[PDB]
Design a protein around this ligand. Structure first.
Ligand SMILES: CC(=O)SCCNC(=O)CCNC(=O)[C@H](O)C(C)(C)COP(=O)(O)OP(=O)(O)OC[C@H]1O[C@@H](n2cnc3c(N)ncnc32)[C@H](O)[C@@H]1OP(=O)(O)O
Length: 214
């Protein structure tokens, strides 16, 4: 429900071996078709969340009316093959004066690893959080995920700051067993962060908005 347990799955060639460019486009999951495709990517990376739990987590955005709120899943698609390259699922929270985002799911797909798409998607999330009204991105980080989030600049949330939202967090946020709570404040995100992450993704050009839309 709001508790989980990260169980990761354990010869893999690069699908970007060609000269490029490889055109790619970001998308928001808005159809059952995209929902199925993102769940398929996740299901090859996770043992738990299992198939039912991925279907509970990856959903169409709320049919509501004024700030961003609720669940959103974005993906990056490789246009040559229509394959999903990576995907993130968030929950957007507005609690009293606290406006923040949590990230239950994040993965890069088979054949696309170690190309910079993880850094790129994280950069696109932080840029979206800045542009919408969010103050920070909060991560429930299983022991196996801490080094990754840490490398990308998330830090262990200080206890005094967690205690300010601890009640709302324990009752509303998606908590992985044994996790550490990590955080990046959006005021620390550089304006050129997406530009620099994309520059590092070799042989890729992005068509459409270079970032996440809602
Ligand atoms: C659901 C959750 O929230 S769990 C959080 C993580 N998700 C998962 O574990 C799902 C399965 N794993 C994956 O999908 C991938 O291994 C990911 C998403 C962790 C990383 O995807 P990649 O495509 O390897 O990321 P990318 O190539 O963009 O790497 C970004 C940078 O992080 C580094 N990095 C990648 N994985 C790790 C790791 N596990 N620990 C530390 N650093 C890492 C890379 O070396 C790279 O460094 P650089 O930019 O300084 O050169």
């Amino acid at each position: 429900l709001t508790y989980s347990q990260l169980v990761l799955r354990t010869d893999q060639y690069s699908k970007l071996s060609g000269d490029g460019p490889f055109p790619m486009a970001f998308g928001l999951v808005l159809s059952e078709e995209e929902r199925r495709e993102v769940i398929d990517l996740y299901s090859l990376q996770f043992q738990y969340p299992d198939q039912p739990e991925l279907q509970r987590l990856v959903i169409l955005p709320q049919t509501h009316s004024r700030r961003a709120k609720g669940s959103y899943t974005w993906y990056l698609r490789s246009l040559n093959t229509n394959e999903m390259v990576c995907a993130v699922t968030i929950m957007a929270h507005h609690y009293e004066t606290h406006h923040f985002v949590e990230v239950p799911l994040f993965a890069t797909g088979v054949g696309y690893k170690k190309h910079g798409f993880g850094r790129l998607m994280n950069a696109a999330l932080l840029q979206w959080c800045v542009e919408t009204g969010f103050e920070f991105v909060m991560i429930s980080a299983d022991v196996k995920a801490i080094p990754f989030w840490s490398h990308l600049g998330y830090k262990t949330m200080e206890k005094s700051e967690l205690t300010r939202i601890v009640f709302y967090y324990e009752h509303n946020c998606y908590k992985f067993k044994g996790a550490e709570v990590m955080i990046r404040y959006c005021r620390t995100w550089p304006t050129d962060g997406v530009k620099e992450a994309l520059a590092r993704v070799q042989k890729v050009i992005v068509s459409g908005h270079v970032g996440l839309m809602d």
